[PDB]
Write a protein that binds this ligand. Structure first.
Ligand SMILES: CC(C)c1cccc(C(=O)c2c(-c3ccc(O)cc3)sc3cc(O)ccc23)c1
Lengths: 154, 153
């Protein structure tokens, strides 16, 4: 039981590393790090509902859009956290690059990310991205809501 | 290695204590921190953390916290140990009334990630990450809609 958990964690960590270092045209094949039914996407959206991309096929299709709209994206300051679950990892990192959304001026997008990676039989079953949507608003020139702080201790 | 398994199990108990601190006990949650410990919210409208530095300042802030989030509870608490015996992550939900100065009383629910870093068996740094748009909604603040034209479905 202990030897099986150690084996899984060691392999899964390599996948997380590979995912976090996937850039450029290699992003078009990042979906191959997922199970056939694997899920990825963005869990912190302005609507409050995740943008959940379900299945390898849809993940591969999403990658075309991702490379179009974030053409030079890099993850930086990557800190990988193993957990007591050999099939569950967290990653804290930064991300930055151009944001190219039709209808908006080209922007420079920087954000602070937490990634959740859950594994099944050596591949990613569920990837979830958590960031601050306000920094994406900023990158697109969208006015950011403000919480008035006058009444708050400072 | 012995210090490590022991530090981790000790710190896990602190994380459990923190996440289950409710009601008037929130007035003493700051005692779980180092004297110079930091706690705060890392996901805000400014893009910068709003942090409270110092155990005693954290205790003073608890008064405001109990006023503005009077019935707050963390639920669906998932505690993650890591390879660093002094670093924990928690995934959870949180909800309760929100009574924010200058805004109508509301109900606030969010999804949270907490980071806990330990020093000498007390919390040196607590950081919470959530989606600020859900807090905006709870306060009646309009949230803009990002158009992702062509996003595959
Ligand atoms: C002070 C930090 C640690 C904190 C703790 C709990 C809730 C909040 C919070 O809810 C927000 C603000 C705030 C600032 C100073 C205070 O003394 C009390 C609260 S300002 C703000 C702006 C946002 O966009 C989202 C949340 C908050 C902060």
């Amino acid at each position: 039981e202990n030897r099986a958990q150690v084996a899984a964690r060691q392999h899964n960590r390599k996948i997380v590393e590979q995912y976090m270092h996937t850039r450029g045209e290699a992003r078009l094949k990042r979906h191959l790090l997922f199970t056939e039914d694997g899920v990825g996407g963005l869990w912190t959206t302005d609507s409050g509902q995740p943008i959940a991309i379900r299945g390898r096929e849809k993940l591969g299709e999403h990658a075309v859009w991702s490379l179009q709209c974030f053409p030079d994206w890099v993850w930086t300051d990557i800190q990988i956290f193993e957990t007591q679950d050999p099939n569950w990892f967290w990653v804290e990192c930064r991300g930055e690059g151009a944001i190219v959304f039709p209808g908006y001026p080209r922007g420079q997008y920087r954000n602070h990310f937490l990634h959740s990676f859950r594994f099944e039989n050596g591949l990613i079953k569920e990837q979830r991205e958590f960031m601050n949507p306000c920094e994406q608003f900023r990158s697109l020139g969208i006015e950011v809501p403000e919480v008035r702080r006058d009444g708050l201790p400072s």
